Structure formats: structure tokens, C-alpha cells
Amino acid sequence: GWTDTAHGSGIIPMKTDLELDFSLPSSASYTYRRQLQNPANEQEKIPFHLQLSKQVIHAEIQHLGHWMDATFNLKTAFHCYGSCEKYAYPWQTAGCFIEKDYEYETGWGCNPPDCPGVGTGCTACGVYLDKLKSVGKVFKIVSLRYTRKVCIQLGTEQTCKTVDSNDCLITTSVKVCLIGTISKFQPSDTLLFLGPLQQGGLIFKQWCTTTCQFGDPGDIMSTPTGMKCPELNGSFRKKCAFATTPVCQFDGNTISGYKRMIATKDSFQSFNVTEPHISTSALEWIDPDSSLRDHINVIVSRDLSFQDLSETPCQIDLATASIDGAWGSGVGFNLVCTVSLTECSAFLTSIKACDAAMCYGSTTANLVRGQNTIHIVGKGGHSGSKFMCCHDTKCSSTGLVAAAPHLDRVTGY
Amino acid sequence: GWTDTAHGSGIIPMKTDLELDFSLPSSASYTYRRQLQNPANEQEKIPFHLQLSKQVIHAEIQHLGHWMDATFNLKTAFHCYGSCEKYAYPWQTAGCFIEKDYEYETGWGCNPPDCPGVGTGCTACGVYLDKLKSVGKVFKIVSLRYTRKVCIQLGTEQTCKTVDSNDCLITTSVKVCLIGTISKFQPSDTLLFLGPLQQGGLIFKQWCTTTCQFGDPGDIMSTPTGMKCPELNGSFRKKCAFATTPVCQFDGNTISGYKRMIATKDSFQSFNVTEPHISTSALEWIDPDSSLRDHINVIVSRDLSFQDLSETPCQIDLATASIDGAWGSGVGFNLVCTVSLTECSAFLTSIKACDAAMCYGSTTANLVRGQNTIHIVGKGGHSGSKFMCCHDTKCSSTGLVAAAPHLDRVTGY
């Protein structure tokens, strides 16, 4: 029952030369040098060197756009004759507006002196948002990954590798394992940056999604493809009589999402960020908070009894078959892989979906000799990303683009 | 100060034969054979065998029922005389409806030609939902548990045991410890399955609970005991005049929860599932995602210095005393246990609430010699479950049924 998925080693403890074991803050790097006694010869020694980089957070993100503050406005129009489609209105120039029409409701005692209409015209009323101000950048977390660069040297062996926070690196005589605490961040958290990235942000758990009303977090969003307006929500009413022009009233919410947030600002969680790097579909940074600690173990054994537990005679070859689903998505894309197994009856291994740069997901494949169809869910990437089936570092040269994510609001009156 | 709650071992490292140490994906199993040198005799060797099953997720769940898509409909009725209770209406046959009556509001200029009424009758108006379509199955997570079957053999010792993700298994000469990363799932997450279980689902963090409006996630739920309708929310209005029958208008939301979800579908998180098994109150599966890795440590020491740290002279006997609270609940049930302690002045131990199959919770009991009353919160089970006080595998033969969970909506106009 072969697998290459166990990353570590089998050891005889009497034939081990060195063990490091400690907790380290994610934001801390660490360096260790020591001359170790040669187990082959007690009168000799060999250099051992360890280097650990600071832990980098990698979030695949959705660029939700800029959060807008706004002012609420209510205006009443009146035409004694003609329907509401015939007339342009002041509010129709605005970035976001709702209109409620009262066509054919002229009667008597709802009219100014100059209107003798009865059951005609249009008393159109508009609520609208102006004084639109960008207050911050908004990203929704699609997925999370935490990595350290690990460099080992034992005499003439030397290898650097990037290692996930609950993975191990294995060389001929050295194993390094990371064990990784709780995350401050979660998939689907929304991050709000009110200024530059370096100045940190706020985490939100309830950013508007399926139903964005004016007053919610993320109510008014501006993307480069255009505005995303919230629904208003509240009832309209004419006050009619005193031989005057009708005066509309709105009972719904008047105060914007941003203003409502700022008033109770200290109800939310902050985070800070050093060395931020933004890409099309990702945000990378180091969290300077030193209260988050990982566990590191290092073990040296320059002996033939040291087993790499990943070693197998099994050989695989990959071909990217087909794709469906979307890029930049927490639901994601479905990549189909044709996977040949040779030299083995069966093999349990990890098959990954990757582009040129990064991998966006991985499935545990239960392979039997010959061809195998394996499905992978990937989460992330952008318009142009060409996703390939991969194992270790070998990828299929066939790469497939995904479809755009469905992230649309539906604003039904 | 005796306790049996430390699961592991005390070791002299020079008298250890083997150490395995590695990271493994939850979805991966693993097998290891090796002939180890006999520490008693250097010219002999003994077989060591390790088998780890894939990690199974066990969620106690609530069957919230099926999520329904629907079409919104508004219809106006009119009777010139008689009150609204006297008449049956078209909308009253429908699965979900709200009605707003305007009794005794006939006046003049709110009537058709055939109605000379003044301050009489009934202008009943109905909003209602039809074209009800099941779109998926819905489960709310009550609790979570992650387990692997661990099998050890060292020569003539052999034991298999199911082990939680941050527990250890201990035999005469072998200890296996699991250390378990972050969970993709949380208690109170709601899982939506749009097709068969095997095709995966969506996680939701904001499924409607205390106030379900039409348009929310989970707005229209169908259980076998009947429909659960959302509230509508929006104002009504007659438009009256032109010597016609009154025409009602509704300003509230027209689009269903499902349709609003699907439009922005890629805002949410997917998960997938292999080997799903559904029961009355639980869902078990293996997550094929290979990016989630646990840490495994194995240590062999066939020596008398190897201590089982759980060993104590303390002896306990249990009796299930009484119960209150509910089954199938995140709040849960309160089981009272009478626990006798003998052979010891004091004893710290774990007392568990279990039925025939599984345990639903466990309390740390601080026992003193003689009788002790211990309370346990259990979370899960179903109508028929008979919960018993247990320690190790010994249970009280008395089992007690809990009461039904309160999971009702209250829809006040």
C-alpha cells in the first residue's frame, strides 16, 4: 500500500546527532550554527547550519473594490400631465438612485393651483446617493496559506525549501517539521484597508453578499467595471393637500454603512501588515504580531538507518484533461486530470492544480496501475491563469483557463 | 494527586528502538513495516508494523430540511360587503402567504361601479409564494470530531484503536500521538448540498435563525413536519380611484434567497466529500482535500522503563442519575452522574455521556473518595437515544432519553 504523502523520517534515536525543539513567533526568523561531532569518528566534527525565514501569509483574494461613503437625498418632482418615462429627472444623473412613481393620481387636493388634472400625469419621487467618497480598499479572502523558507546544511548536504506551516522538509540526514497554531484569519473574512496597506486593516465577518441594503457593511461598492449600489428599503408616501405640490416622504434608513461602522468602530478587530505585496488575485504579507507562535523540530542523523518515509518505486505521468468552474472563487474550479501509474499496483498520492507561479488546491488520489481520472478543486487565480495538473514539481504542459466568477447583486424593487 | 487523563508515556531516550515523525494529509492512510533490532539481544530482530487509516470527520447535525426556491405573487380581492374571515381566497391554498386586510374602507372613489358601500366590506390583499422547488439538503453542525484508526504491532504486541486528532494511543512498548491542524468546519456552520452528497456542498456562516425574511439564506425551509415560511417584510398600499376595483401594491423584496445566492455564488466556500455516511443525527465523511495535514509521532521502546502515564490505582463506578435538556442541540443536554471513587483519596478523570454507539461530550471530574455528583453537557443524538454515564468503556446500564430541541420560528406580522 504505497504512498509518498508521509513527509518525514524513521529514526534510530541512539544514532541521532542533534535535536532542536522550540517555539518561534511567525514574524521571527532564526539562525543556528553548530559544529557537531562526526558519528563515524569521535575525534572529528562537521558543520551544521539552520536558517528559517519569517512566516509569510498568502491570501488568494477577490478585489471587491472600494467602499464608498455617501449622503442620502430625497427629491419630489411633479408633472400635471404625461407619464414618468417622458421626463428626465435631477436624480437620474446620480451614481445610485431608486424612483417611486405615482402616475395617474392627480385627483383633487393633491395638486398645486396650476394643475386641474384628475387621474393623470406623474408624481415621481427619487431617493439618491451623492457625495460619493472612497473610504477604503476591500478584499475577500478566498484561501489561506502560511509558509517559511527553511535552509539546512550538514557538512556537504545543503538544501533550501519553502515549507507549509504543518509540513516537514526532509534531506539525507536532516528533518525539519513545522507545527502551526490557530489562524487570526479565515476564508471568507473581508479585509478593509482605510489607508495604505502598511497601516493595517479591519476584519469583518458580516460584509454584505446576497442582500446589500444601504446601512450595511459594504453597502456601496465601486469596482472598475462600475458602481454596485445597495437597495434602499423603506416605504414612500405622498403628503397631499393644502393646494400644494405633493411632498414625498421616506421612512427607511438615512445613514450610510461607513458612518454606522465608524460610530461603533471599536467593536471590530484590527490587524497589521509588514512587507505587503499585492498581485492580480493575491495579497502576501508578514504579520508583525509576535503572539502567534509555531513549533519547530529539527533532528540530525548522519546514518544509513535514517529513512525518508516518502520513498516509493511508484512512477506517475499527468495530462490536464478538462476544466469547469471559475477563477477567483471560494467555490472554485474543477480540474480533471488523467494520471498514469506505473511500477506499482496501487499508489496514494497528492495531485495539485497549478499555474506557473502557485498551486491552488490538491486532491488525495487513490491510483491503480494504468490510467486514472482524478478531479481537483482549485481556489484562486485570475482571468489569464492557465491551470495544469501537477505532482511534485512536474506539471502537464497543457494549461486551461477558467470562467469568470459570478459575484453579482440582484436589486429587485 | 492521581489522574488517568495524561495519554502518553515517560521514556529513557537511550532505551528507545525507533522513532517515526512526519506530516500526513488527513485524506491519506499510511503503512510501515520494519524489522527492528532486539534491544535484549543485538544478533536478533523483531517485526514492527504501523497502520493509520484516513481521518474521518464526524459531525453531529440538525436536519434543517430542504431549501426551497419560490416565485413571489401579489393578488387583490374585493367584496363590497362582509368581513374578510367570511371569504375563502385564492392565496389561502398556497404553501406560504401573508394577507393584509382593509375592512370597512369603502368610502367613495375606492370602489368599482357595482359597489355603493361606504365604510364596509373587505379589500383583502395577499402576497404568496408558489412554484416551490427543492434546491438542496441543509444540515447545521452541532459538533465535530476527527478520528483515525491506528494499528500497532511490535512482535507479539498488537492493538488497533480509534484515536482523536489530538490524542495518543499507548501500548506496552509503543506510543502513537496525533497533533491536529485547523478545521475547515466549525460548530454552527450550515452545509448546503445542491445535489448528491458526493458532489460536495457550500458552507454558510449566515443561515437564518431568529428572523427569517424572504431573500435570506434559508428563508423557505421544508421539513417532513411541514413548511417553514419566511416573513415577508415590506409595506402594503391600495391605489384607489378612477372608479375601479382597488389595486394593491407591495414595496418589499421580490427575489428569493436561492436566486440571490446563485447570482453571487462565487462569494461562498465549497467543500467536497468521499465515502459519505448519513445517520439520524450525524454525517460522516473523508475530505479528499490533501492540503490539510496532521502531525504523527511514533516511538518504540521495548523496555521496562517505558511508563504508561495513565496508570493509577484509582477505581470508579458510575450510575446515571438524571437528565434535562435536549437532543440534537448545540446547547445540548445535561446528564447527572453519581460517581463512586475507591482506592484513592482524590482522582481527576474524564466522565462521558454516551449512547450505544458514540459519546456526545465529556467533563473533567475532580473526585474525592466516596460518592460524587458530576454534570455533563452532551451535544447530539436523536429522539430515541438513551444516554449513559461512562468512564473508559464502562457505562452505567441506566440510559435516559432527552427532550426534543426547540428550533421554531416565530412569525409576528
Add this chain to the structure above:
Amino acid sequence: GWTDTAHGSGIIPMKTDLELDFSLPSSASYTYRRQLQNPANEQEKIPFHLQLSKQVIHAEIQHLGHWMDATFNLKTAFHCYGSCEKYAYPWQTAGCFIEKDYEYETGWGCNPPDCPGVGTGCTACGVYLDKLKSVGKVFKIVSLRYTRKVCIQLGTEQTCKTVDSNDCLITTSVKVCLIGTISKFQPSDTLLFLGPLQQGGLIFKQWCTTTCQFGDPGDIMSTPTGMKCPELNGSFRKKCAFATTPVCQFDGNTISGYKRMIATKDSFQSFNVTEPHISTSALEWIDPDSSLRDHINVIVSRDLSFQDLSETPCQIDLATASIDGAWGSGVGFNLVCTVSLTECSAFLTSIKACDAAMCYGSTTANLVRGQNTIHIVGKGGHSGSKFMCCHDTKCSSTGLVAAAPHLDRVTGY
């Protein structure tokens, strides 16, 4: 590249005397005695003693106040002349109320017999909440910390220290490391206590924040500084005619947050609490749930090869420079520290913000020889707290008070 942030040790495994390794419930303490063979002399032995306390949870909190149940009431007033400011109304004495006025709308067929007014007066209508009952205490989690007291003795060495759940304690010959599972609690969770603390509580993920409507969790909050009333939300309407006094109607929600919670109570998560201790800005307790297990490792090596990995020649001195931001906040306060580095070219270390009792946060500082300006985010504390820049246990004697947190609702009609 010096750092003091690696908490643990470098070891030669053949020169180790003892290793303990096991899982332990958070609610369990543990004691271990053993006479170990003296490595210096095989015919002698030395006493080794380990004591671990139960794990204590420390939450910095916000006292949100008491959650109130209430009864909804709608009353209509009428004055044939004079505006609504001129008259006191029955509802104006109540703890929470909204009022909707219809000034100058007398007309004809909206009046009792005693009112011949036309376009005058005031038909004021009030919705209001009475029968206010406290149902529980409410705390919002600002931050979380999990600690155990660890006591070691190896012969003549003895040290007790409080250790975070993913930190290690290091002495001359002994290292103890804690590795800490998932948390049941998260920052920004709101905890509701319906009775005394000892009887446990409910966790909520959606407690009202930026927009509190009547019917929401936390809709009606009572603090010592006064009531916090929700918004109502729903439309008003006069029914007019039949030569009577106007009768107002409200279409919005009638049922309170509490009642709506209790109806579906078993949708939520409970927790329980032993040995609770409440302070101005914090809640400390031990969770009696025994299903949460940490990993403990202990390693003894009474040998000169045992390295304390935190040892450096680097020397620091601190001065608290300035502060901005707030106490009792998840966003928190920004403390500026002047940090002198001597004896070293560069130094990576942790700089903490603390008052007399506890530390409220810590930053990873990348120091170079001489003066360094370092920023720290602290989360927690109260009005009087005087926050100091600290490293190890040495603090600057200058302490600085923060500003009050902004936690206000804005209720715009």
C-alpha cells in the same frame, strides 16, 4: 543575526535522561515524580518533579451590559390644533420609543365630531417598549489567551512559570513545550449569560453592531451609562374616516430579540465555566469540557551540551514615547516605544505593551544598534490602565492612559 525569540533547546539525544510526551485535557492538571539515574554517575540518582496546572482562558472583554426583553406597544394621540412639540405624550416617559407625526393633516373624514380643523394640529403616533426585563449579562471578546502554570524540579534546579499554549519553558537542564489545539472561542464572539457565570452561557456570532433593529440579538441593551434602544423599522399608517379619531397602524416587527432567540434556542452553542473571575476588562475561567486536549513534551538533559536557544549578548533599554487609540477595543491602542540596542549590530526581539498586571499585545522588533522607534498594537485594558513598553519583565516606568472606545449606535429615523 541574533534573536531571543526561539523558546526551547538544542540537545544531543544520547545525553538525555528523560522524555515525557502525552496529550492532556485543558481542564486537567498533572503531577509527575521520578528518581532519575545521575548521568555523571550510574550508581546515583536525582529527583525529577513536574507539575502542570489546568489551562486558564483569559478573555479581554467589553461589558456590553444587560440584554433586555420587552413588550411592543402602539398608541394614537390626537389634537385638533397645535403642533406635536407643544404636547407631552404617554409614550415619552418610556425607555425606548419612536414617534411619527402627521401635523396639518386634519382635512375632512379624518376627524372626530369635536374637531372642525382643516390642515392643522397633530396626529402623533408612538411605538414604544415597556415591561423591560433584564435576561442576561453580555460580553464581547476582545482577545484570548490560554495559559498553564508549569513547575519543574530536577534535583537542585526548581522553577515555576506561566506558559502560553504554544510556548515553551526552558531551565538549565529541562524544557517543557505546550502545543495547543483549536479554540472553542474566537475574537468578536459575544457571550450571553442568562444566570450566574457558573451556569454557563451561549455563544453568538451575529450580535447586533452597526444596525440594531428590534428583533435582533442584542437589540435592547442596558448599560450603566443608560439604555441603548434599537431602531424599529416598519411603516406607519393612519386609517381615517367613519367620523372618528385617527387610528395608527404599524406593519413592522412586534416580537423582541430575546423571545425570537428562545423559540429557536437549540440552534446556538452553549459553553460552561468553572472558577470564573471577572475584572474591569477581563473574564478568566477553566472550561470543564475534557474533549479539548493540548500536547505536552518534557525533556531532561543534565549536560553541558544542553543549549538555551534564547541566549544572546544583546542588551535592550526601553522608554514609552507616546500613545493613541483606545482601551477595551478589538481595534485597540497604538503604543510607541523608544528601544536602545547595545552589544549587538542587529537584534530581532519581542516588545510588549503592558500595564501592572498583564500584557495586551506584542510586536516583533527588527532592531539595529542605537535608538529604534517601535509601534505596538495593544488590545484590552480599562479607563485607568497605564500601558508601558516592556521586554522580558523589564518595563519602562512611563505608563500612558488610552482614550475611551467608540461603541455608539446611531439611530437615524
